[PDB]
Design an enzyme around this catalytic site. Structure first.
Site, PDB file in Angstrom:
ATOM      1  N   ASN A   1       0.842  -1.232   0.000  1.00  0.00           N
ATOM      2  CA  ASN A   1       0.000   0.000   0.000  1.00  0.00           C
ATOM      3  C   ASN A   1       0.867   1.268   0.000  1.00  0.00           C
ATOM      4  OD1 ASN A   1      -1.933  -1.848   2.273  1.00  0.00           O
ATOM      5  ND2 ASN A   1      -2.624  -1.372   0.196  1.00  0.00           N
TER       6      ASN A   1
ATOM      7  N   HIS B   1       2.929   2.297   2.274  1.00  0.00           N
ATOM      8  CA  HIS B   1       3.172   2.770   3.663  1.00  0.00           C
ATOM      9  C   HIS B   1       4.482   2.164   4.171  1.00  0.00           C
ATOM     10  CE1 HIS B   1      -0.740   4.760   4.391  1.00  0.00           C
ATOM     11  NE2 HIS B   1      -1.136   3.913   3.432  1.00  0.00           N
TER      12      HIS B   1
ATOM     13  N   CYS C   1       5.699   7.989   8.693  1.00  0.00           N
ATOM     14  CA  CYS C   1       6.694   8.687   7.836  1.00  0.00           C
ATOM     15  C   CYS C   1       6.312   8.274   6.405  1.00  0.00           C
ATOM     16  CB  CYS C   1       8.097   8.291   8.279  1.00  0.00           C
ATOM     17  SG  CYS C   1       9.401   8.552   7.049  1.00  0.00           S
TER      18      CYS C   1
END
Ligand SMILES: O=C(O)c1cccc(Cl)c1
Ligand SMILES: O=C(O)c1cccc(Cl)c1
Lengths: 265, 268
Positions: free
Chosen positions: A186, A188, A223
Site C-alpha cells: 500500500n 506505507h 513517515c
C-alpha cells in the site's frame, strides 16, 4: 502454520535464514519483528479478515499500531526452527492487543515474547475513534474470552510512560530515508523500518559489548515515502538503558519515541 | 531443501511472505535475490564449504582467499504471489581459472513452470588487499567434484543477455537519488553491505511513472568495489530505449564507481 485446536490462537514454524542473522550470528530483532507481522497476517487470513472487517471496509476504518513491546531471551541461530504462537484480544472501546510467544522448537522453552496495541482510525482523515459494538461483536468470536497475557506481571515493562528526549541528544543518526523495499504493498513505510531507524543511533561500543533484551516503541505519526528522519538516543543508566526519538529532519515533528534495554554479552 | 539425487545440484521450496511483496502484491526482485543467496548458502553447507557468504574451502581459508561476486544477472517471467510455493534449484560450475559460476532456476511449485532464472560470476580475492588472482588447480580439485562435469547453463544461448558489456553512464544522468547510506540490517554477520542492497539502491532512481506502468523483467549488475558501512551512494539512471535503463552507483563524494547495471521493463 495453523489455528490451534480451540481456534483462538495461530501457530507457525520458521527456519532462520542466512540473510536474517546479524553481528552475533543470530537473528536480528528486525527479522524477529518480520516473523511477528507474518504470523499476524496468517492468523487474520485464517479467520477471514483482510486486518479489516466488512464493517470496517464500509466505513474506511483501519487498525494501526499505537505501541509495540518485544522482549528476547535468546536470538535464534541460522537454521534453528523457531515456533511463534499469536492471539489478539479486545481492550473494549480502546482497541485490540496482539500478543506473541516465541519458542525453541527442539527444547520447547520460551526464547522471546511480544505485545502490541492497535487503535482504530479513519484511513483518509487519519482520525482515531473508539471501537463500536458492531465491530467488536464481529472479532470477539476470534479472541480468547478469558484474559491471556504474554506479559502477565501486574507491573511489567510494556505499559510504562515513555518521556520525550530533550535536545541536546547524546547520539544521533541524521538524514534517514526509506527505500522502495521499506514500503508495504500500500506504499506505507513498514513498521519494522522504524525499529532499524531507532537502533541506527545506538553506539557501536554497545553493539560490540552488549545484546538487546527489550525494545518499547510508540507510533505517533507515519513517515511518508519522501520524508527524512533523524534518530536521537541518550543513555538513562551491567545493564544499559537508552531513551529514543525519531522526528522529521526538517521541522522536528515527532513520528516515534521509545526505550531499549541491553545486557552484557 | 536437499541435494538432488546425483549430488550435483540443490533444491529448496519457499512460501512467499506478507512483508516480501511489493506494489503489485508479488515478490520484490530484492526478495527473489535474498532467496537465491539463501539456497546458495544451503548448497555450500550441504557439501561442507563455508557459510560466511565467502564459500571458502580448506586451501582458501589459510591463504586468506574468498569468493566475491563480479556479476549477477536475473530474468523474471512471473513474480510469485503471497502464499505461493516457489522451488529454486541451484548449481555451481568451474570457468577455467577465471573463477566460478552459480546458476539458479525458479519454478511455480504447483504448475512446475519456469517463472525466473539467474546466473552470477564469482572471482577469487585476498581479503586484506582486495586483490583478485586467477584460481589454482589445487583449489579446483576439491570443488569440481561438486559441479556437473558437462556444461549446464541457466542461460544456455551462445552470446546471450547475461554476457554483454555495460558502459559507464555519462553526466548528466536523466534520474538520480543521492545521499544513500546502508543501515545495520543491510550488513551481513561479516559486517559487509549485502549485495542485494545494491539492487535496491540501483532501482531507487527508476522513475515512479515506470514503477506505475511497467514490471521489471531483467537486471544485470557489475560489482566494481564494496560500499563500506560509513559510505554514501548516489544512484544514477538514464533511459536507453519495452523500456531499458543504464545504471551507475558511485560514492556521493568523489564519485568513485561501486556498481554499473542495466534493467529491462515490460508493460503491465
Ligand atoms: O542495535 C543495533 O545497532 C543493531 C541494529 C541492527 C542490527 C544489529 Cl546486529 C544491531
Ligand atoms: O524501483 C522499483 O521499481 C522497485 C523497487 C523495490 C520494490 C518495488 Cl515494488 C519497486
Amino acid at each position: 502454520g495453523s489455528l490451534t485446536e480451540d481456534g483462538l490462537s495461530y501457530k507457525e514454524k520458521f527456519v532462520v535464514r542466512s540473510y536474517e542473522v546479524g553481528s552475533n550470528k543470530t537473528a536480528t530483532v528486525e527479522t524477529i519483528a518480520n516473523l511477528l507481522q507474518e504470523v499476524g497476517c496468517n492468523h487474520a487470513q485464517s479467520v477471514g479478515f483482510s486486518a479489516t472487517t466488512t464493517t470496517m471496509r464500509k466505513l474506511h476504518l483501519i487498525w494501526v499500531t499505537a505501541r509495540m513491546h518485544i522482549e528476547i531471551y535468546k536470538y535464534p541461530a541460522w537454521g534453528d526452527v523457531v515456533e511463534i504462537e499469536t492471539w489478539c484480544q479486545s481492550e473494549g472501546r480502546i482497541g485490540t492487543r496482539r500478543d506473541w510467544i516465541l519458542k525453541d522448537s527442539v527444547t520447547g522453552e520460551v526464547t522471546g515474547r511480544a505485545t502490541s496495541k492497535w487503535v482504530m482510525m479513519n484511513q483518509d482523515t487519519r482520525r482515531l475513534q473508539k471501537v463500536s459494538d458492531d465491530v467488536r461483536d464481529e472479532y470477539l468470536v476470534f479472541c480468547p474470552q478469558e484474559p491471556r497475557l504474554a506479559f502477565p506481571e501486574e507491573n511489567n515493562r510494556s505499559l510504562k510512560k515513555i518521556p520525550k528526549l530533550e535536545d541536546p541528544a547524546q547520539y544521533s543518526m541524521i538524514g534517514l530515508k526509506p527505500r522502495r523495499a521499506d514500503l508495504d504493498m500500500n506504499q506505507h513505510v513498514n513498521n519494522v523500518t522504524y525499529i532499524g531507524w531507532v537502533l541506527e543511533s545506538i553506539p557501536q561500543e554497545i553493539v560490540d559489548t552488549h545484546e538487546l533484551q527489550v525494545i518499547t516503541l510508540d507510533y505517533r505519526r507515519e513517515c511518508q515515502q519522501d520524508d527524512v528522519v533523524d534518530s536521537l538516543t541518550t543513555t538513562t543508566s551491567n545493564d544499559s538503558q537508552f531513551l529514543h526519538l525519531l522526528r522529521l529532519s526538517g521541522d522536528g515533528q515527532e513520528i516515534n519515541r521509545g526505550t531499549t534495554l541491553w545486557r552484557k554479552k
